[PDB]
Write a protein that holds these residues in place. Structure first.
Motif, PDB file in Angstrom:
ATOM      1  N   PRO A   1      42.762  43.710  52.243  1.00 29.49           N
ATOM      2  CA  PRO A   1      43.510  42.479  51.969  1.00 29.49           C
ATOM      3  C   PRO A   1      42.587  41.277  51.806  1.00 29.49           C
ATOM      4  O   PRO A   1      42.926  40.311  51.127  1.00 29.49           O
ATOM      5  N   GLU A   2      41.421  41.345  52.437  1.00 27.92           N
ATOM      6  CA  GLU A   2      40.447  40.268  52.350  1.00 27.92           C
ATOM      7  C   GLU A   2      39.848  40.247  50.953  1.00 27.92           C
ATOM      8  O   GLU A   2      39.980  39.263  50.226  1.00 27.92           O
ATOM      9  N   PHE A   3      39.184  41.339  50.585  1.00 25.80           N
ATOM     10  CA  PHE A   3      38.569  41.450  49.271  1.00 25.80           C
ATOM     11  C   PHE A   3      39.551  40.920  48.236  1.00 25.80           C
ATOM     12  O   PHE A   3      39.191  40.121  47.373  1.00 25.80           O
ATOM     13  N   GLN A   4      40.799  41.368  48.337  1.00 23.65           N
ATOM     14  CA  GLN A   4      41.835  40.930  47.416  1.00 23.65           C
ATOM     15  C   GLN A   4      41.925  39.417  47.488  1.00 23.65           C
ATOM     16  O   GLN A   4      41.765  38.728  46.484  1.00 23.65           O
ATOM     17  N   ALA A   5      42.175  38.911  48.691  1.00 24.01           N
ATOM     18  CA  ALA A   5      42.291  37.478  48.925  1.00 24.01           C
ATOM     19  C   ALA A   5      41.209  36.682  48.197  1.00 24.01           C
ATOM     20  O   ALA A   5      41.516  35.794  47.399  1.00 24.01           O
ATOM     21  N   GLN A   6      39.945  36.992  48.472  1.00 20.13           N
ATOM     22  CA  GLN A   6      38.844  36.289  47.816  1.00 20.13           C
ATOM     23  C   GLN A   6      38.984  36.392  46.302  1.00 20.13           C
ATOM     24  O   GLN A   6      39.136  35.377  45.616  1.00 20.13           O
ATOM     25  N   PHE A   7      38.928  37.622  45.792  1.00 18.10           N
ATOM     26  CA  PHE A   7      39.048  37.867  44.359  1.00 18.10           C
ATOM     27  C   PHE A   7      40.167  37.009  43.780  1.00 18.10           C
ATOM     28  O   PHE A   7      39.961  36.264  42.821  1.00 18.10           O
ATOM     29  N   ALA A   8      41.349  37.112  44.376  1.00 19.81           N
ATOM     30  CA  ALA A   8      42.494  36.335  43.925  1.00 19.81           C
ATOM     31  C   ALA A   8      42.143  34.854  43.974  1.00 19.81           C
ATOM     32  O   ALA A   8      42.285  34.132  42.986  1.00 19.81           O
ATOM     33  N   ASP A   9      41.680  34.407  45.133  1.00 22.37           N
ATOM     34  CA  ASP A   9      41.314  33.013  45.305  1.00 22.37           C
ATOM     35  C   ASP A   9      40.301  32.574  44.257  1.00 22.37           C
ATOM     36  O   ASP A   9      40.479  31.544  43.607  1.00 22.37           O
ATOM     37  N   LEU A  10      39.239  33.356  44.095  1.00 21.26           N
ATOM     38  CA  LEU A  10      38.207  33.023  43.122  1.00 21.26           C
ATOM     39  C   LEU A  10      38.816  32.901  41.731  1.00 21.26           C
ATOM     40  O   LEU A  10      38.576  31.926  41.019  1.00 21.26           O
ATOM     41  N   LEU A  11      39.608  33.900  41.357  1.00 20.29           N
ATOM     42  CA  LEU A  11      40.268  33.920  40.057  1.00 20.29           C
ATOM     43  C   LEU A  11      41.039  32.620  39.870  1.00 20.29           C
ATOM     44  O   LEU A  11      40.961  31.974  38.827  1.00 20.29           O
ATOM     45  N   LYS A  12      41.777  32.245  40.906  1.00 24.39           N
ATOM     46  CA  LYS A  12      42.596  31.046  40.884  1.00 24.39           C
ATOM     47  C   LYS A  12      41.844  29.736  40.670  1.00 24.39           C
ATOM     48  O   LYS A  12      41.863  29.163  39.581  1.00 24.39           O
ATOM     49  N   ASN A  13      41.173  29.278  41.721  1.00 22.76           N
ATOM     50  CA  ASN A  13      40.459  28.011  41.707  1.00 22.76           C
ATOM     51  C   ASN A  13      39.140  27.886  40.951  1.00 22.76           C
ATOM     52  O   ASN A  13      38.631  26.779  40.794  1.00 22.76           O
ATOM     53  N   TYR A  14      38.574  28.988  40.478  1.00 19.82           N
ATOM     54  CA  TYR A  14      37.312  28.882  39.756  1.00 19.82           C
ATOM     55  C   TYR A  14      37.438  29.251  38.290  1.00 19.82           C
ATOM     56  O   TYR A  14      36.982  28.508  37.419  1.00 19.82           O
TER      57      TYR A  14
END
Ligand SMILES: *Cc1c(COP(=O)(O)O)cnc(C)c1O
Ligand SMILES: *Cc1c(COP(=O)(O)O)cnc(C)c1O
Ligand code: NA
Ligand code: NA
Lengths: 237, 375, 375, 237
Positions: free
Chosen positions: B37-50
């Motif tokens: 769930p973490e890896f996902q979280a980051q990836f998702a987050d990165l995809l989002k704000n960057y």
């Protein structure tokens, strides 16, 4: 296949290692290569390692010499025609042996006098089709055994392999893997180094290919004569 | 292995033994991350704000005028980098990190990938070295500028594989598309699957109904499969892949091995390819160098085999026209590569204007890079 | 008039009588649209599904490393066109339509505006003619390609004004920035105000606290004021505008009239300007031609007058460095114009590393256009 | 200011319209312009329209002739020195009159002998500062009355204006706007056309500027002599 067996027989009855020199088929062009092999053979070579189109430059060289996959099998037969005993190994890539049918290829191999074939890009994990088809047509399927080897990998190459192992030496023996052949050999010291190491012999890859490119304009052979002679003598005992 | 390295009869791991452990480690690292769930979280987050995700779904209303087909557009060009590529490149990097890697290995012909890798490397702080041949400009600088280490393709792929072979312990390989040996094909899809997922939810909102078909160009199949994936189970919606026909299939100077190649074995996989009569790998012409991969995604070869996906083609002129057309009628400049896809949709509606169809093409990128040539 | 054509002592409508009716009509059309939930709806909708809005707020974590200041970035470069410009251009177009216009008039030096107008024209279907001089390339084509009709600046502004003068009944003028005569300055701000609004809500989420300061470069002040607007009432957060110092203020070859000009009367407004000792309008040097406006937004001159906003400067080298830096540490390539702003933030933190500050600079665009030069 | 009044007096006592020719100050260079005006004046010109740096080319021309805002006021005085009666009008832009103080400018105007000043970019809606400062120093603030005119605009220019209106004719009179002067006049027909139209006269803008640029290499004057003479005669009655 049984050709290698024979070689590792008389070779042992002489307590000496095997020295298999590798080279690209029709590298310089065609007639020259047909010669290089002739020399390599009478120079001392026990077995043979012919690759189909440093090694890179070898290919580039051959290519520029109109060497179609059909032109080599011609050489393979010719060669075998004069040398019925020396074992012949082939270095290939999946696509080439896959191209016009897997079996068709192996079948054509038994027809020319090839003894063993090793597919540089076919791991033990995807060799079934190649393994069976090879055995079927009485061809030794040579598999490479690299550094980052495993126990299962060691067990797989010892069971699926044949003719000889492309190199541990104790486990490969414990597993009953075809006589392992060590292949960074450029000096007689390494040759005898391997023999003593436990390897049934050594293979001089690009090592010899260079001698061929460092005299491209001077048809070289004498250099191969000696280079091999030396290497060979180093294996004796 | 943990996953299925094969899609029907296409796929596998046809690589020297030496690289098998590397691949095995990768699939293990991926299967693990996939459920974190973490890896996902980051990836998702990165995809989002960057990167910019989610991408907009613009609904073309000018070009379609005069016909009964509504054309929706997936703005993959509104993403950081101006191409879908800068998407999976991140997840791969994140993966490299999760694995403990400190360097990245990559290659490119035009540079599109060399940039994505570079940009992904810089942000995540990873030593990145790209491999380029003679086709080597605006990106070489773009790449270097981004810390990248600038150093044909099938050949460029070897050098890369060679390197990685002896270094995978620290350096990781960043495959450019959904091709190559397992688990790459499976990895790049997962790291490009949000495209369709977003497309589904979006269209469901704008028209409370799934599209009739979804068109996507195919150079390697990464962007295509990214769009297809989430729709595979939806039998109603059709999946159309478009390969570059270059000067025309009947001319020999094209780039559609999926439908005019012949299954062979190279690039560490078993799928259709552009090769001579006796096995020699060949090139793939097209105005858009971003579509010069002489092969295709094994899952694409399989999807077309069981007839789940339809693959068509489009010549240079066809794309060149669909290109200028988008500019003039929507104020959007698409990639010559993306044109191809959009160029088929046009034909689809032009041939049957009275035909009521709701399709959506995938705009994999902006055309600012192809402006010089198209000129 | 309905609105206040003046910001303190700056502003007005210093244009030939002939153009007064045009301006009067415009303010009436704007005041009306401003309160129309529909107009809003469309504009909002268009911004959303076509342009890309909302823009992401990337939080730089590499460059700030080593210091105690967190740098947030407003991704105005992730917007269709790669610049904040393609924002107000739409609302103006929508306005032109609401008014019954069938053609658009515009001008540009580099072409950045000529494109936005063109792209906005094409989508909304409006005959658009741009005015360019000698500085006239990749965009001339880009513009034409988009249907646009390619035909100094202060001079280019006259030709434009001349045209419009006799045609305003059908053709509308698209001012390039938040300058010019009323109600332009007020219009362009409203059509660029979502930038700050989004920035506010976003930061409030990521840090449940408003920024310390907000930096934004200033060529005309459109992007700056777009970011400032919604924060004016928030006295705590500071507003910093950055004008191009070129080779250095003390050299004379710069472009900061706001703080080194001298209030004069031109461009249909009364504000600081770059003029000789006896009233002759001059140029404004800077590496980024996107910042060559020899004047500034009257609301900026006023905001600085009552000390509500602080305006600093930055030379070429300063920006050139802040440029390369972003690439290497964030994988983002900013516009040489946007650099300036970001280049000040760097200095802000570099000079006082132990200083705890949470600032956010406005990235008005990508640097792909300035890659050739910066090279 | 009262200069215009006088002109529109003797002009009426002769039932003839006024013909004011416009030209750029120091256009050709300086001495030439100082001459063109001399000719224009004795050629028939009743009033004068001097603009400070087609009309565009006129500026470009002058500029390349080192004509600073100080060099003209020199000419303005010189001119007035030989012609104490002919009214002089000035065409300017806000910034120039705003530059070194609004009043300072107007004050300098009364000092050289200027009668009326019209700021091309100052609408009746933003002229207060310019209007007052003008009246204060006894200078007629001329405002342009364009086509898309209004009733209030008509009322504003009739009340704020002075000296003469830069052109309806009935309403402008009904409102009591300074003698309206029509200004696309290139042929004697239009001259008399306006007079009869109701306008107290006409102004030949670029019309004359051309005659100056179509002989740039041939110091032209004769052409201006006649061109004006004609135009003037057309106003007589
Ligand atoms: C790289 C690229 C492609 C090719 O990618 P696939 O791997 O074939 O999806 C297509 N379009 C654009 C804009 C690209 O950048
Ligand atoms: C046009 C532009 C600017 C200048 O715009 P303002 O009107 O000064 O806001 C600044 N940055 C970018 C990226 C631009 O495109
Ligand atoms: Na392809
Ligand atoms: Na400026």
């Amino acid at each position: 296949m049984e050709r290698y067996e024979n070689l590792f027989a008389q070779l042992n009855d002489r307590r000496e290692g095997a020295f298999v020199p590798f080279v690209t088929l029709g590298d310089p062009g065609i007639e020259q290569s047909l010669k290089i092999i002739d020399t390599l053979i009478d120079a001392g070579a026990d077995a043979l390692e012919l690759g189909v189109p440093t090694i890179q430059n070898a290919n580039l060289r051959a290519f520029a010499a109109g060497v179609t996959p059909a032109q080599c099998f011609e050489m393979l037969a010719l060669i075998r025609e004069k040398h019925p005993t020396i074992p012949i190994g082939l270095l290939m890539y999946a696509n080439l042996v896959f191209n016009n049918g897997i079996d068709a290829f192996y079948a054509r191999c038994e027809q020319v006098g090839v003894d063993s074939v090793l597919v540089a890009d076919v791991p033990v994990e995807e060799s079934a089709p190649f393994r069976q088809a090879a055995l079927r047509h009485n061809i030794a399927p040579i598999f490479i055994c690299p550094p980052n080897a495993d126990d299962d990998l060691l067990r797989q190459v010892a069971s699926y392999g044949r003719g000889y192992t492309y190199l541990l030496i104790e486990k490969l023996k414990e597993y009953h893997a075809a006589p392992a052949l060590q292949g960074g050999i450029s000096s007689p010291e390494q040759v005898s180094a391997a023999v003593r190491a436990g390897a049934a012999g050594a293979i001089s890859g690009s090592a010899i290919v260079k001698i061929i490119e460092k005299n491209l304009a001077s048809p070289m052979l004498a250099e191969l004569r000696s280079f091999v002679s030396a290497m060979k003598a180093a294996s004796r005992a | 292995t943990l996953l299925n390295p094969y899609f029907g009869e296409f796929g596998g791991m046809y690589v020297p033994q030496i690289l098998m452990p590397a691949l095995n480690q990768l699939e293990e690292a991926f299967v693990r991350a996939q459920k974190d769930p973490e890896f996902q979280a980051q990836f998702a987050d990165l995809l989002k704000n960057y990167a910019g995700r989610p991408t907009a779904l613009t609904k073309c209303q000018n070009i379609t005028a005069g016909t009964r087909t509504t054309l929706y557009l997936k703005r993959e060009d509104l993403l950081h980098g101006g191409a879908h590529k800068t998407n999976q490149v991140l997840g791969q990097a994140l993966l490299a990190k999760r694995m403990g890697k400190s360097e990245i290995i990559a290659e490119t012909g035009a540079g599109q990938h060399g940039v994505a890798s570079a940009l992904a490397s810089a942000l995540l702080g990873l030593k990145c070295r790209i491999y380029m041949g003679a086709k080597d400009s605006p990106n070489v600088f773009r790449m270097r500028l981004m810390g990248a280490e600038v150093i044909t393709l099938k050949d460029a792929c070897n050098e890369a594989l060679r390197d990685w072979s002896g270094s995978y312990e620290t350096a990781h390989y960043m495959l450019g598309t959904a091709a190559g040996p397992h688990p790459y094909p499976t990895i790049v899809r997962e790291f490009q699957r949000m495209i369709g997922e977003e497309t589904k939810a979006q269209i469901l909102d704008k028209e409370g109904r799934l599209p009739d078909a979804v068109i996507a160009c195919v150079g390697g199949g990464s962007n295509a499969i990214g769009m297809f994936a989430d729709f595979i189970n939806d039998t109603s919606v059709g999946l159309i892949g478009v390969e570059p026909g270059g000067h025309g299939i009947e001319t020999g100077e094209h780039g559609a091995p999926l439908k005019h190649g012949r299954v062979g074995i190279y690039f560490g996989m078993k799928a259709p390819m552009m090769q001579t009569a006796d096995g020699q790998i060949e090139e793939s012409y097209s105005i858009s160098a971003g579509l010069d991969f002489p092969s295709v995604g094994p899952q694409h070869a399989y999807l077309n085999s069981i007839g789940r996906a339809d693959y068509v083609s489009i010549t240079d002129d066809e794309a060149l026209e669909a290109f200028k057309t988008l500019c003039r009628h929507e104020g959007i400049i698409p990639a010559l590569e993306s044109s191809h896809a959009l160029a088929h949709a046009l034909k689809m509606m032009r041939e049957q204007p009275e035909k009521e169809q709701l399709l959506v093409v995938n705009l994999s990128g902006r055309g600012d890079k192809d402006i010089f040539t198209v000129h």
